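Sample 1 of the test manifest.
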Amino acid sequence: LAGLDTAIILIAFIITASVLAYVAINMGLFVTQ
Amino acid sequence: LAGLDTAIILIAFIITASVLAYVAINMGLFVTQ
């Protein structure tokens, strides 16, 4: 099925969103300060 | 995002105001003397 496939792609794509926010926020506070 | 670029756009122009103010006050401080 894809239900177990989609759930795995979900966790992966969610982490890459967290890393993107981790860097984007950091660079936000850096150039601001 | 309009937050990072604006901060750089900001600092790019605040630098410009500093250099113009630099040669501005230097202009008056000379001619009056």
